[PDB]
Coordinates of C-alpha atoms and ligand atoms in Angstrom, one line a residue:
Chain P
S1 CA 4.6 28.5 -14.2
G2 CA 6.5 26.7 -11.5
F3 CA 6.7 23.1 -10.4
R4 CA 6.3 22.2 -6.7
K5 CA 5.8 18.9 -4.8
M6 CA 2.1 19.6 -4.1
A7 CA -0.2 17.9 -1.6
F8 CA -4.0 17.7 -1.8
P9 CA -5.8 20.2 0.5
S10 CA -6.0 18.4 3.9
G11 CA -9.1 19.9 5.4
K12 CA -11.4 16.9 4.7
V13 CA -8.9 14.6 6.6
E14 CA -8.2 17.1 9.5
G15 CA -11.8 16.8 10.5
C16 CA -11.3 13.0 11.0
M17 CA -8.2 13.0 13.2
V18 CA -8.6 11.8 16.8
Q19 CA -6.2 10.7 19.6
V20 CA -6.4 7.0 20.8
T21 CA -4.9 6.0 24.1
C22 CA -4.6 2.5 25.5
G23 CA -2.6 2.3 28.7
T24 CA 0.7 4.0 28.2
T25 CA 0.5 4.2 24.4
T26 CA -0.9 7.3 22.6
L27 CA -1.3 7.4 18.8
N28 CA -3.7 8.8 16.1
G29 CA -7.0 7.4 14.9
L30 CA -9.2 8.1 11.9
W31 CA -12.8 8.8 12.8
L32 CA -15.2 8.0 10.0
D33 CA -19.0 7.7 10.7
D34 CA -19.2 5.8 14.1
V35 CA -15.8 3.9 13.8
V36 CA -12.3 5.0 14.8
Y37 CA -9.5 3.2 12.8
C38 CA -6.0 3.0 14.3
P39 CA -2.9 0.6 14.3
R40 CA -3.6 -2.5 16.3
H41 CA -0.2 -2.1 18.0
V42 CA -1.9 0.5 20.3
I43 CA -2.8 -2.5 22.5
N44 CA -0.7 -12.6 19.7
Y45 CA -3.0 -9.7 19.0
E46 CA -6.2 -11.7 19.5
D47 CA -5.0 -12.8 22.9
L48 CA -4.1 -9.2 23.9
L49 CA -7.4 -7.8 22.5
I50 CA -9.6 -10.3 24.3
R51 CA -8.2 -9.0 27.7
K52 CA -9.4 -5.4 26.8
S53 CA -12.8 -3.8 27.4
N54 CA -14.3 -0.8 25.7
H55 CA -13.5 1.6 28.5
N56 CA -9.8 0.8 28.3
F57 CA -9.6 2.7 24.9
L58 CA -9.6 6.5 25.5
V59 CA -10.6 8.4 22.3
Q60 CA -10.3 12.1 22.2
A61 CA -11.7 14.3 19.4
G62 CA -10.5 17.8 20.0
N63 CA -11.6 18.6 23.6
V64 CA -14.4 16.0 23.6
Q65 CA -14.0 12.4 24.9
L66 CA -15.7 9.8 22.6
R67 CA -17.3 6.8 24.2
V68 CA -16.1 3.4 22.8
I69 CA -19.1 0.9 22.6
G70 CA -17.4 -1.9 20.6
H71 CA -14.0 -3.1 19.2
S72 CA -12.9 -5.5 16.5
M73 CA -9.7 -6.2 14.6
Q74 CA -9.3 -6.4 10.8
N75 CA -5.8 -7.5 9.8
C76 CA -3.4 -5.0 11.4
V77 CA -6.1 -2.3 12.1
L78 CA -8.2 -1.9 15.2
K79 CA -11.8 -0.7 14.6
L80 CA -13.2 1.1 17.6
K81 CA -17.0 1.5 17.5
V82 CA -17.9 4.9 19.1
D83 CA -21.4 6.2 20.2
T84 CA -21.2 9.3 18.0
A85 CA -21.0 9.5 14.2
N86 CA -18.4 12.1 13.0
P87 CA -20.5 15.0 11.7
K88 CA -17.4 16.0 9.6
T89 CA -17.2 12.6 7.8
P90 CA -16.4 13.4 4.1
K91 CA -17.4 11.3 1.1
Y92 CA -14.7 8.5 1.2
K93 CA -13.4 5.1 0.0
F94 CA -10.6 2.8 1.2
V95 CA -8.3 2.1 -1.7
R96 CA -5.1 0.1 -1.9
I97 CA -2.4 1.8 -4.1
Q98 CA 0.4 0.3 -6.1
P99 CA 4.2 1.1 -5.9
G100 CA 4.9 4.3 -7.9
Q101 CA 1.6 5.8 -7.0
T102 CA 1.7 9.1 -5.0
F103 CA -0.4 10.4 -2.1
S104 CA -0.6 13.1 0.5
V105 CA 0.2 12.4 4.2
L106 CA -1.3 14.4 7.1
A107 CA 1.3 13.9 9.8
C108 CA -0.4 14.0 13.3
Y109 CA 0.7 13.8 16.9
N110 CA -1.9 13.4 19.8
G111 CA -4.8 13.5 17.3
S112 CA -3.6 17.0 16.1
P113 CA -2.4 17.5 12.5
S114 CA 0.9 19.2 12.3
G115 CA 1.9 19.0 8.6
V116 CA 1.1 17.8 5.2
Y117 CA 3.4 16.5 2.6
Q118 CA 3.4 14.6 -0.7
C119 CA 5.1 11.3 -1.2
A120 CA 5.2 8.0 -3.2
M121 CA 4.9 4.4 -2.4
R122 CA 8.4 3.2 -3.3
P123 CA 8.9 0.0 -5.4
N124 CA 10.2 -1.6 -2.1
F125 CA 6.8 -0.7 -0.5
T126 CA 8.4 1.8 2.0
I127 CA 7.7 5.5 2.0
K128 CA 10.4 8.1 2.6
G129 CA 8.3 10.1 5.1
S130 CA 9.0 12.5 7.9
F131 CA 7.7 11.0 11.1
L132 CA 8.7 11.2 14.8
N133 CA 7.4 9.2 17.9
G134 CA 3.6 9.6 18.2
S135 CA 3.0 9.8 14.4
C136 CA 1.5 6.2 14.3
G137 CA -2.0 6.3 12.8
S138 CA -1.2 9.3 10.5
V139 CA -2.9 8.7 7.1
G140 CA -2.2 8.9 3.4
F141 CA -4.9 9.9 0.9
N142 CA -5.8 11.3 -2.5
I143 CA -8.9 13.4 -3.5
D144 CA -11.1 12.8 -6.6
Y145 CA -13.6 15.6 -6.9
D146 CA -15.2 15.5 -3.3
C147 CA -14.3 11.9 -2.5
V148 CA -11.3 11.2 -0.2
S149 CA -9.6 7.9 -1.0
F150 CA -7.7 6.7 2.1
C151 CA -4.8 4.6 1.1
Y152 CA -2.2 4.5 3.9
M153 CA -2.0 4.4 7.7
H154 CA 1.4 4.8 9.3
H155 CA 2.6 2.0 11.6
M156 CA 6.4 2.0 12.0
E157 CA 9.9 3.3 11.1
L158 CA 12.5 0.9 9.8
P159 CA 16.3 1.1 10.8
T160 CA 17.2 3.1 7.7
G161 CA 14.8 6.0 8.6
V162 CA 12.1 4.9 6.0
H163 CA 8.5 4.1 6.9
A164 CA 6.1 1.2 6.7
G165 CA 2.3 0.9 7.0
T166 CA -0.9 -0.6 5.9
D167 CA -3.9 0.2 3.7
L168 CA -7.1 1.1 5.7
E169 CA -8.2 -2.5 5.7
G170 CA -5.0 -3.3 7.7
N171 CA -3.0 -5.1 5.0
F172 CA 0.7 -4.1 5.1
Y173 CA 2.3 -2.6 2.0
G174 CA 5.5 -4.8 1.7
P175 CA 6.9 -7.8 3.6
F176 CA 6.6 -6.1 7.0
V177 CA 5.0 -7.2 10.2
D178 CA 3.8 -5.0 13.1
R179 CA 6.3 -6.1 15.8
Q180 CA 9.8 -5.3 17.1
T181 CA 12.0 -7.7 15.1
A182 CA 14.8 -7.6 12.5
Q183 CA 13.1 -6.1 9.4
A184 CA 14.8 -4.3 6.6
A185 CA 13.7 -2.5 3.5
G186 CA 14.7 -4.3 0.3
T187 CA 17.0 -2.6 -2.3
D188 CA 15.0 0.3 -3.7
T189 CA 14.6 1.3 -7.4
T190 CA 13.7 4.5 -9.3
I191 CA 10.1 4.8 -10.6
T192 CA 10.9 5.2 -14.4
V193 CA 7.4 6.2 -15.5
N194 CA 7.4 9.0 -12.9
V195 CA 10.9 10.3 -13.9
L196 CA 9.6 10.5 -17.6
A197 CA 6.5 12.4 -16.4
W198 CA 8.8 14.9 -14.6
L199 CA 10.9 15.3 -17.7
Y200 CA 7.7 16.1 -19.7
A201 CA 6.8 18.6 -16.9
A202 CA 10.2 20.2 -17.3
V203 CA 9.6 20.6 -21.1
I204 CA 6.2 22.1 -20.5
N205 CA 7.9 24.7 -18.1
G206 CA 10.6 25.6 -20.7
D207 CA 13.5 23.3 -19.8
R208 CA 14.7 21.5 -23.1
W209 CA 18.5 21.2 -22.8
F210 CA 18.2 17.4 -22.2
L211 CA 16.2 16.7 -25.4
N212 CA 17.9 15.1 -28.3
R213 CA 17.1 14.0 -31.9
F214 CA 17.3 10.3 -30.9
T215 CA 14.8 7.5 -30.2
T216 CA 15.2 4.0 -28.7
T217 CA 13.4 0.7 -28.6
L218 CA 11.6 -0.3 -25.3
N219 CA 13.9 -3.4 -25.1
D220 CA 17.1 -1.3 -25.4
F221 CA 15.9 1.2 -22.9
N222 CA 14.8 -1.6 -20.4
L223 CA 18.4 -3.0 -20.5
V224 CA 19.7 0.4 -19.5
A225 CA 17.0 0.8 -16.8
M226 CA 18.0 -2.6 -15.3
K227 CA 21.7 -1.4 -15.3
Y228 CA 20.9 1.8 -13.4
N229 CA 18.4 0.4 -10.7
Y230 CA 15.4 1.8 -12.6
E231 CA 12.1 0.0 -12.6
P232 CA 11.2 -1.7 -16.0
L233 CA 9.1 0.5 -18.3
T234 CA 6.1 -1.4 -19.6
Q235 CA 3.8 -0.7 -22.6
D236 CA 1.1 0.4 -20.0
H237 CA 3.5 3.2 -18.9
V238 CA 4.1 4.2 -22.5
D239 CA 0.3 4.4 -23.1
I240 CA -0.2 6.4 -19.8
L241 CA 2.4 8.9 -21.0
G242 CA 0.5 9.4 -24.3
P243 CA -1.2 12.7 -23.4
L244 CA 2.1 14.3 -22.3
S245 CA 3.8 13.0 -25.5
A246 CA 1.0 14.6 -27.6
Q247 CA 1.1 17.9 -25.7
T248 CA 4.9 18.4 -26.0
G249 CA 5.6 16.7 -29.4
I250 CA 8.2 14.3 -27.8
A251 CA 7.5 10.6 -28.3
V252 CA 7.8 8.5 -25.1
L253 CA 10.7 6.5 -26.6
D254 CA 12.3 9.8 -27.7
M255 CA 12.1 11.0 -24.0
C256 CA 13.6 7.5 -23.0
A257 CA 16.7 8.3 -25.2
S258 CA 17.0 11.6 -23.3
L259 CA 16.7 9.6 -20.0
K260 CA 19.3 7.1 -21.3
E261 CA 21.8 9.9 -22.1
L262 CA 21.1 11.5 -18.6
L263 CA 21.8 8.1 -16.9
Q264 CA 25.0 7.4 -18.8
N265 CA 26.4 11.0 -18.7
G266 CA 24.8 12.8 -15.8
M267 CA 23.5 16.4 -15.7
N268 CA 26.9 18.1 -16.3
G269 CA 26.5 20.9 -13.6
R270 CA 22.9 21.6 -14.9
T271 CA 19.6 21.2 -13.1
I272 CA 16.0 20.3 -14.3
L273 CA 13.2 22.1 -12.5
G274 CA 15.6 23.2 -9.8
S275 CA 16.9 19.7 -9.1
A276 CA 20.3 18.0 -9.7
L277 CA 18.8 14.5 -9.3
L278 CA 16.1 12.8 -11.5
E279 CA 12.8 13.2 -9.6
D280 CA 10.5 10.1 -9.4
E281 CA 7.7 11.2 -7.0
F282 CA 5.4 12.8 -9.6
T283 CA 3.1 10.5 -11.5
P284 CA 1.9 11.2 -15.1
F285 CA -1.5 12.2 -13.6
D286 CA 0.2 14.6 -11.0
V287 CA 2.0 16.4 -13.9
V288 CA -1.2 16.8 -15.9
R289 CA -3.1 18.0 -12.8
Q290 CA -0.5 20.5 -11.7
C291 CA -0.1 21.8 -15.3
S292 CA -4.0 22.2 -15.6
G293 CA -5.2 23.3 -12.2
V294 CA -7.9 20.7 -11.1
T295 CA -9.7 21.9 -7.9
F296 CA -11.4 20.2 -4.8
Chain C
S1 CA 13.5 10.2 11.2
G2 CA 13.2 11.7 7.7
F3 CA 13.1 15.2 6.4
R4 CA 10.5 16.5 4.1
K5 CA 9.4 19.9 2.7
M6 CA 6.3 20.1 4.9
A7 CA 3.3 22.4 4.6
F8 CA 0.9 23.3 7.4
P9 CA -2.5 21.5 7.3
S10 CA -4.7 23.7 5.0
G11 CA -8.2 23.1 6.4
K12 CA -8.4 26.4 8.3
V13 CA -7.6 28.3 5.1
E14 CA -9.8 26.2 2.8
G15 CA -12.9 27.3 4.8
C16 CA -12.0 30.9 3.9
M17 CA -11.6 30.7 0.0
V18 CA -14.2 32.3 -2.2
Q19 CA -14.5 33.3 -5.8
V20 CA -14.6 37.0 -6.7
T21 CA -15.9 38.1 -10.1
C22 CA -16.0 41.7 -11.5
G23 CA -17.1 41.8 -15.1
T24 CA -15.0 39.4 -17.2
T25 CA -12.3 38.8 -14.4
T26 CA -12.6 35.9 -12.0
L27 CA -10.1 35.3 -9.1
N28 CA -9.8 34.2 -5.5
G29 CA -10.8 36.1 -2.3
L30 CA -10.1 35.4 1.4
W31 CA -13.3 35.6 3.5
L32 CA -12.6 36.4 7.1
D33 CA -15.4 37.6 9.4
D34 CA -17.6 39.9 7.1
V35 CA -14.8 41.0 4.7
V36 CA -13.5 39.4 1.5
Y37 CA -9.9 40.4 0.7
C38 CA -8.7 40.1 -3.0
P39 CA -6.1 41.7 -5.4
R40 CA -7.4 45.1 -6.5
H41 CA -6.5 44.2 -10.1
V42 CA -9.9 42.3 -10.2
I43 CA -11.4 45.7 -11.2
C44 CA -9.0 46.0 -14.3
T45 CA -9.3 45.0 -17.9
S46 CA -6.1 43.5 -19.6
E47 CA -5.7 47.0 -21.4
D48 CA -6.1 48.8 -18.0
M49 CA -3.1 46.9 -16.7
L50 CA -0.4 49.1 -18.4
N51 CA -1.2 52.2 -16.4
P52 CA -4.3 51.6 -14.2
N53 CA -5.7 54.4 -12.1
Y54 CA -7.3 52.2 -9.4
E55 CA -9.0 55.1 -7.6
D56 CA -10.6 56.2 -10.9
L57 CA -11.7 52.6 -11.8
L58 CA -13.0 51.9 -8.2
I59 CA -15.1 55.1 -7.9
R60 CA -17.1 53.9 -11.0
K61 CA -18.1 50.6 -9.3
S62 CA -21.0 49.8 -7.1
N63 CA -21.5 47.0 -4.6
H64 CA -23.6 44.9 -6.9
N65 CA -20.8 44.9 -9.6
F66 CA -18.8 42.5 -7.4
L67 CA -20.0 38.9 -7.5
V68 CA -18.8 36.9 -4.5
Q69 CA -19.4 33.1 -4.4
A70 CA -18.7 30.9 -1.4
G71 CA -19.2 27.3 -2.4
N72 CA -22.7 27.2 -4.0
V73 CA -23.9 30.4 -2.1
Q74 CA -23.8 33.9 -3.5
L75 CA -22.6 36.5 -0.9
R76 CA -24.1 40.0 -1.0
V77 CA -21.5 42.8 -1.1
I78 CA -22.6 45.8 1.1
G79 CA -19.4 47.9 1.0
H80 CA -16.0 48.2 -0.7
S81 CA -12.8 49.9 0.1
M82 CA -9.2 49.8 -1.2
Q83 CA -6.2 49.4 1.2
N84 CA -2.9 49.7 -0.8
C85 CA -3.1 46.9 -3.5
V86 CA -5.9 44.9 -1.8
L87 CA -9.6 45.4 -2.3
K88 CA -11.8 44.8 0.8
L89 CA -15.3 43.7 0.1
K90 CA -17.7 44.1 3.0
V91 CA -20.3 41.2 2.8
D92 CA -23.6 40.7 4.7
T93 CA -22.5 37.4 6.2
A94 CA -19.7 36.7 8.6
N95 CA -17.7 33.5 7.7
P96 CA -18.8 30.9 10.3
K97 CA -15.6 29.0 9.4
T98 CA -13.3 32.0 10.3
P99 CA -10.3 30.7 12.3
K100 CA -8.3 32.6 14.9
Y101 CA -6.0 34.7 12.6
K102 CA -3.5 37.6 12.3
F103 CA -2.0 39.5 9.3
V104 CA 1.8 39.4 9.5
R105 CA 4.4 40.8 7.1
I106 CA 7.3 38.4 6.7
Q107 CA 11.0 39.1 5.8
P108 CA 13.1 37.4 3.0
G109 CA 14.2 33.9 4.0
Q110 CA 10.9 33.2 5.9
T111 CA 8.9 30.2 4.8
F112 CA 5.1 29.7 4.5
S113 CA 2.5 27.4 3.0
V114 CA 0.6 28.3 -0.1
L115 CA -3.0 27.1 -0.8
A116 CA -3.2 27.4 -4.6
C117 CA -6.8 28.1 -5.6
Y118 CA -8.8 28.5 -8.9
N119 CA -12.4 29.8 -8.9
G120 CA -12.5 29.9 -5.1
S121 CA -11.7 26.1 -5.0
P122 CA -8.5 24.9 -3.4
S123 CA -6.4 22.6 -5.6
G124 CA -3.1 22.1 -3.8
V125 CA -0.8 23.0 -0.9
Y126 CA 2.9 23.5 -1.0
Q127 CA 5.7 25.0 1.1
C128 CA 7.9 27.8 -0.1
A129 CA 10.1 30.7 1.0
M130 CA 10.1 34.5 0.4
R131 CA 13.3 34.8 -1.7
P132 CA 15.9 37.5 -0.9
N133 CA 14.8 39.3 -4.1
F134 CA 11.2 39.3 -2.7
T135 CA 9.8 36.9 -5.3
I136 CA 8.5 33.4 -4.6
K137 CA 9.2 30.3 -6.7
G138 CA 5.6 29.1 -6.7
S139 CA 3.4 26.9 -8.9
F140 CA 0.6 29.1 -10.2
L141 CA -1.5 29.1 -13.3
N142 CA -3.9 31.8 -14.7
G143 CA -6.8 32.1 -12.2
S144 CA -4.6 31.6 -9.2
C145 CA -4.6 35.3 -8.2
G146 CA -5.8 35.8 -4.7
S147 CA -4.3 32.5 -3.5
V148 CA -2.7 32.9 0.0
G149 CA 0.4 32.1 1.9
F150 CA 0.2 31.4 5.6
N151 CA 1.8 29.8 8.7
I152 CA -0.2 28.1 11.5
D153 CA 1.7 28.3 14.7
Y154 CA -0.5 26.7 17.5
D155 CA -4.2 27.3 16.5
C156 CA -3.8 30.8 14.9
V157 CA -3.4 31.2 11.2
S158 CA -1.0 34.0 10.3
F159 CA -1.7 35.2 6.7
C160 CA 1.4 36.6 5.1
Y161 CA 1.0 36.6 1.4
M162 CA -1.6 37.1 -1.3
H163 CA -0.7 36.2 -4.9
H164 CA -1.0 39.0 -7.5
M165 CA 1.3 38.3 -10.5
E166 CA 3.8 36.2 -12.4
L167 CA 7.0 37.9 -13.6
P168 CA 8.6 37.0 -17.0
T169 CA 11.0 34.5 -15.5
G170 CA 8.1 32.4 -14.1
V171 CA 8.5 33.6 -10.5
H172 CA 5.7 35.2 -8.5
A173 CA 5.1 38.5 -6.8
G174 CA 2.5 39.5 -4.3
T175 CA 1.5 41.5 -1.2
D176 CA 1.0 41.1 2.5
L177 CA -2.7 41.0 3.6
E178 CA -2.6 44.8 4.1
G179 CA -1.9 45.2 0.3
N180 CA 1.8 46.3 0.5
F181 CA 3.9 44.5 -2.1
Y182 CA 6.9 42.4 -1.2
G183 CA 9.7 43.9 -3.3
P184 CA 9.9 46.7 -5.8
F185 CA 6.9 45.5 -7.8
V186 CA 3.7 47.2 -8.9
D187 CA 0.3 45.7 -10.0
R188 CA 0.9 47.0 -13.6
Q189 CA 1.9 45.1 -16.7
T190 CA 5.0 47.4 -17.1
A191 CA 8.5 46.0 -17.7
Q192 CA 9.3 44.5 -14.3
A193 CA 12.1 42.1 -13.5
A194 CA 13.1 40.2 -10.4
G195 CA 16.5 41.3 -9.1
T196 CA 19.4 38.8 -9.1
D197 CA 18.5 36.1 -6.6
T198 CA 20.7 34.8 -3.9
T199 CA 20.8 31.7 -1.6
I200 CA 19.4 32.1 2.0
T201 CA 22.6 31.2 4.0
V202 CA 21.0 31.0 7.4
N203 CA 18.5 28.4 6.0
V204 CA 21.2 26.3 4.3
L205 CA 23.1 26.2 7.7
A206 CA 19.8 25.2 9.5
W207 CA 19.4 22.4 6.9
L208 CA 23.0 21.2 7.5
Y209 CA 22.2 21.1 11.3
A210 CA 19.0 19.1 10.4
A211 CA 21.3 16.6 8.5
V212 CA 23.5 16.2 11.5
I213 CA 20.4 15.6 13.7
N214 CA 19.3 12.9 11.3
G215 CA 22.8 11.1 11.5
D216 CA 24.8 12.5 8.6
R217 CA 28.2 14.1 9.2
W218 CA 30.2 13.4 6.0
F219 CA 30.5 17.1 5.2
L220 CA 31.9 18.4 8.5
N221 CA 35.6 19.3 8.7
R222 CA 38.1 20.2 11.4
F223 CA 38.1 23.9 10.5
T224 CA 36.5 27.1 11.8
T225 CA 36.1 30.5 10.2
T226 CA 35.7 34.1 11.2
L227 CA 32.2 35.6 10.2
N228 CA 33.9 38.1 7.8
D229 CA 36.0 35.4 6.0
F230 CA 32.8 33.2 5.7
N231 CA 30.9 36.2 4.1
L232 CA 33.9 37.0 1.8
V233 CA 33.8 33.5 0.4
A234 CA 30.0 32.9 0.4
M235 CA 29.2 36.1 -1.4
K236 CA 31.3 34.8 -4.3
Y237 CA 28.7 31.9 -4.7
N238 CA 25.8 34.4 -4.6
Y239 CA 25.0 33.5 -1.0
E240 CA 23.3 36.2 1.2
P241 CA 25.6 37.7 3.9
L242 CA 25.3 35.9 7.3
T243 CA 24.7 38.5 10.1
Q244 CA 25.2 38.2 13.9
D245 CA 21.4 37.8 14.2
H246 CA 21.6 34.7 12.0
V247 CA 24.4 33.3 14.2
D248 CA 22.3 34.0 17.3
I249 CA 19.3 32.4 15.8
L250 CA 21.3 29.2 15.0
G251 CA 22.4 29.0 18.8
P252 CA 19.8 26.3 19.8
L253 CA 20.8 24.0 16.9
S254 CA 24.5 24.6 17.7
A255 CA 23.9 23.6 21.4
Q256 CA 21.8 20.5 20.3
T257 CA 24.4 19.1 17.9
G258 CA 27.6 20.3 19.6
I259 CA 28.8 22.0 16.3
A260 CA 29.5 25.8 16.7
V261 CA 27.9 28.1 14.1
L262 CA 31.3 29.2 12.7
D263 CA 32.4 25.5 12.5
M264 CA 29.2 24.8 10.5
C265 CA 30.1 27.9 8.4
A266 CA 33.5 26.2 7.6
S267 CA 31.7 23.0 6.4
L268 CA 29.5 25.2 4.2
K269 CA 32.6 27.0 2.7
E270 CA 34.1 23.6 1.9
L271 CA 30.8 22.3 0.4
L272 CA 30.7 25.3 -2.0
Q273 CA 34.3 24.6 -3.0
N274 CA 34.1 20.9 -3.5
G275 CA 30.5 20.2 -4.5
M276 CA 28.9 16.9 -3.2
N277 CA 31.1 14.3 -5.0
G278 CA 28.2 12.0 -5.9
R279 CA 26.8 12.3 -2.4
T280 CA 23.5 13.7 -1.1
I281 CA 22.5 15.4 2.1
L282 CA 19.0 14.6 3.3
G283 CA 18.1 13.1 -0.1
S284 CA 19.3 16.2 -2.0
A285 CA 22.2 16.8 -4.4
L286 CA 21.9 20.6 -4.0
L287 CA 22.2 22.8 -0.8
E288 CA 18.6 23.4 0.3
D289 CA 17.6 26.9 1.5
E290 CA 13.8 26.8 2.0
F291 CA 13.9 25.5 5.6
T292 CA 14.4 28.1 8.4
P293 CA 16.1 27.4 11.7
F294 CA 12.5 27.5 13.2
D295 CA 11.2 24.9 10.6
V296 CA 14.2 22.5 11.5
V297 CA 13.5 22.7 15.2
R298 CA 9.7 22.2 14.5
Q299 CA 10.2 19.1 12.2
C300 CA 13.3 17.3 13.7
Ligands
ROZ1 N1 -1.3 31.9 -18.6 C1 -1.3 33.1 -17.9 O1 -1.9 34.1 -18.4 C2 -0.7 33.1 -16.5 C3 0.1 32.0 -16.1 C4 0.5 32.0 -14.8 C5 0.0 33.0 -13.9 C6 0.5 33.0 -12.5 N2 0.2 34.0 -11.7 C7 -0.5 35.0 -12.1 C8 -1.0 35.1 -13.4 N3 -1.5 36.3 -14.0 C9 -1.0 37.6 -13.8 O2 0.1 37.9 -13.6 C10 -2.1 38.6 -14.0 C11 -1.5 40.0 -13.9 C12 -0.9 40.6 -15.0 C13 -0.2 41.8 -14.8 C14 -0.2 42.4 -13.6 C15 -0.9 41.9 -12.6 CL1 -0.8 42.6 -11.0 C16 -1.5 40.7 -12.7 C17 -0.7 34.0 -14.3 C18 -1.1 34.1 -15.7
CL2 CL1 9.6 37.0 9.2

């Protein structure tokens, strides 16, 4: 029993964190095999990069200085070729995630990991993280068996306190650019399929006060979701929720009628899994994994 | 900016998790140097759990009855001893991945990270607090016994909790790494219940200071309070009494924000009276009590 916001064990990623210094700027890098990946803003980026030599980039792995022997740019990520392969390199892939998907973040400062938290890629492509100055280059990831799938690298904080970054191939999530200019996060929405998954997790843990005898059509629910700044629920989301529906005996559209009643009438002084708000940062897969105990 | 429930990086603890099997029971052990620490209830059957005599059960065991597995390697047990509710299995190999560590006993209100494990394999990490009633509101399934709680301040891992059992309300009970339980609990399947829980007042105050540091002041008011009047009101909402030690501990956050502790106590009194009125504080519609004054200073 119990339901916590749970991150993946961070050990496989900790063994990859390094410090990258270029001039006055110090940030974090990801050392995989013989390449160190970091935000290109550590340095017209092609014009700024052509003026740099390998010895201008100082890379520190623990108390050891790594020698940079090459450098190249891929989108908004700088790739520093080093003379030593990371002996701690885990099995890994670079994957691009979609809004609504969750991942763990290993927040780092000076190439030293300080904390790990779980979060979701918001529908507006920002993340509600917890980062201070020096956190740039911190990474987001998921784990599948023994394979680490790197999905995010931190680049900047927006004026509202939310965060923006890229996949590990340097492509930004969202309409952001890596420079000091007027940029704002778009109006955010609630991840509907995730709220539904969290309602199924509450039923599994013995919280059934919000259940009702009613059902709804997907069209009627989507009109209600549009009214309350909730993302549209598609047939794919309904299919994905299938296992949780079979486990609890509550049809997905039956759980939508509960969500509709919660949106129109509130919680009435009650909580669900210790929360007075509807939680949207647990995917259907996170709920099944936390209520089954899958290990890495 | 931002404020998240943040756990310590778990790598130093992952390299210590092993699987301990005794007969039909399989649970987790903590491998530090040449000793594997695990709940002594690994020697029990489900029947034995009503009134186990651990000394009588342990004397019937030999070293080869305990199967210890570290990854794909079987460790050889060369000795065994019991210390309170923890079993200490001497093994023939020192853990090469043993970090710098200490065993510390924490007090209610203190927070720590938990590395939840099954079959000696880590599955997840979360942050939690030792409740005033000595239970933890964890997320643990069958097989999670032996999972550990820790803090990593600087490069030293301070182990403070080992998971032993789930109570009927879904909350969890365990021991420090010397095998002494937190709370009036016993490793017996006897009728045991968590005492009435309360809110950790010093932690809610710390979290209100974190909100002010992140730019939010909507909840502040022009009033102050005496410590006694604050306690008379807060105890009516099931809040723990605030002591002079708590007021002293909040000193740095008071100096940073310019809001005296007893003025912050007056905003807390008002929040309990009024509720939030559709507003949130650091993305929460409830008053959060699982961040200590130390966690707020560390994260903000
Ligand atoms: N499904 C379960 O059996 C279950 C679920 C969540 C569980 C979460 N934590 C622990 C489990 N087990 C026990 O508490 C074992 C036990 C029993 C009595 C006395 C002691 Cl000291 C130990 C858990 C089991
Ligand atoms: Cl303590």
